[PDB]
Amino acid sequence: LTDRGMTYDLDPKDGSSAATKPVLEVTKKVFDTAADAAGQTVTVEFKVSGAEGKYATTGYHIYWDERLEVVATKTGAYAKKGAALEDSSLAKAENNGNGVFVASGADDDFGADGVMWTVELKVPADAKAGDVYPIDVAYQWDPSKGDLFTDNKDSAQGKLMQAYFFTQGIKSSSNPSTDEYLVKANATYADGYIAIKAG
Amino acid sequence: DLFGDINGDGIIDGRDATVLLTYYAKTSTGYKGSLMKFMEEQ
Amino acid sequence: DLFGDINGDGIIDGRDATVLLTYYAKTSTGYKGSLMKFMEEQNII
Ligand SMILES: [Ca+2]
Ligand SMILES: [Ca+2]
Ligand SMILES: [Ca+2]
Structure with missing residues (x-):
C-alpha cells in the first residue's frame, strides 16, 4: 500500500472549534494464526461517530493493501452502504483499483452515526505470520473537485465539521496512527487493518 | 458558466x-x- | 432550457x-x- 492521502488545504483548515466533531473508525481484525486468516473474508466497516443528524453530503477515498481481494456486491460495487446512510437517498461507491470512493447526499441532514460503508475483503492463501494488510481512509483534492464531509447547506458549521473529519476524524500522514500493526507496516497514515501475529 | 455546477462555485x-x-x-x-x-434564498 | 435538468428529461x-x-x-x-x-457513455442520454 501507498499514501494517496493529501493535505487538507481548504478554509477553514482547523476544525477543533467545530460544533460537530465526526470520527471515522475502520475495522481492525487480528488473526492468531495464518491458518485462521487464509481465505477468510473480513467485513470491513467504516463507522462514523458524533454526527447524528449533522451531515448530508459526503465523499472520501478508501484504499487497502494490494494483496487483499475485494469481493464486489451483487451489482459489482466494491462497497455497500451501511445503516448510517439509510436515510441519505443518494449514495455511490465507485471502484478505484485497490480502493473505492464512497459518496453520500441527502435532502436534509439525515446523516447518522453508525456504519457508513461496508467493504468485504479477503486474505491471500499465502497468508504468512505477522502479515499486516492496511486499510486507509484518505482525503484527496484537486482544482476540479475535492473530498467532502459537510451538512445539507455547506454552512460555516459544515465546513468546520469537514475540516475536523479529515484532519482529526481520520488518520493521515499528519495525524498518524500509533497502532502496533500500522507501525509494523509503515502505514501510520492508514486507519484500519487486517493483521496476523508472530510465533 | 459550467454545466453541472448548480451552486456555481466552478466545481462539480x-x-x-x-x-x-x-x-x-x-x-x-x-x-x-x-x-x-431557491438556492439564493439560502 | 431548464437549469438543473442534467439528464434533459424536462424535469428536475x-x-x-x-x-x-x-x-x-x-x-x-x-x-x-x-x-x-459521461452521460453518453452511461446511456443517460
Ligand atoms: Ca488515512
Ligand atoms: Ca458546484
Ligand atoms: Ca431530469
Missing part, C-alpha cells in the same frame, strides 16, 4: 447533487420557486 | 442529482472527460 462535486436533491424534496411537496431562486 | 428530480453524484464519483477515481461525455 457532491454538493451540487445535494442541492438538486433538496430542491426536489421541496417542489415534490409544493415549492413554486426556480432552482436559482 | 432525484435522477439529475444521481447523475451529478455518480459523475463526482468517477472524476474522484481518475476519470477525465466531461459530464456530457
Whole structure:
C-alpha cells in the first residue's frame, strides 16, 4: 500500500472549534494464526461517530493493501452502504483499483452515526505470520473537485465539521496512527487493518 | 458558466447533487420557486 | 432550457442529482472527460 492521502488545504483548515466533531473508525481484525486468516473474508466497516443528524453530503477515498481481494456486491460495487446512510437517498461507491470512493447526499441532514460503508475483503492463501494488510481512509483534492464531509447547506458549521473529519476524524500522514500493526507496516497514515501475529 | 455546477462555485462535486436533491424534496411537496431562486434564498 | 435538468428529461428530480453524484464519483477515481461525455457513455442520454 501507498499514501494517496493529501493535505487538507481548504478554509477553514482547523476544525477543533467545530460544533460537530465526526470520527471515522475502520475495522481492525487480528488473526492468531495464518491458518485462521487464509481465505477468510473480513467485513470491513467504516463507522462514523458524533454526527447524528449533522451531515448530508459526503465523499472520501478508501484504499487497502494490494494483496487483499475485494469481493464486489451483487451489482459489482466494491462497497455497500451501511445503516448510517439509510436515510441519505443518494449514495455511490465507485471502484478505484485497490480502493473505492464512497459518496453520500441527502435532502436534509439525515446523516447518522453508525456504519457508513461496508467493504468485504479477503486474505491471500499465502497468508504468512505477522502479515499486516492496511486499510486507509484518505482525503484527496484537486482544482476540479475535492473530498467532502459537510451538512445539507455547506454552512460555516459544515465546513468546520469537514475540516475536523479529515484532519482529526481520520488518520493521515499528519495525524498518524500509533497502532502496533500500522507501525509494523509503515502505514501510520492508514486507519484500519487486517493483521496476523508472530510465533 | 459550467454545466453541472448548480451552486456555481466552478466545481462539480457532491454538493451540487445535494442541492438538486433538496430542491426536489421541496417542489415534490409544493415549492413554486426556480432552482436559482431557491438556492439564493439560502 | 431548464437549469438543473442534467439528464434533459424536462424535469428536475432525484435522477439529475444521481447523475451529478455518480459523475463526482468517477472524476474522484481518475476519470477525465466531461459530464456530457459521461452521460453518453452511461446511456443517460
Ligand atoms: Ca488515512
Ligand atoms: Ca458546484
Ligand atoms: Ca431530469
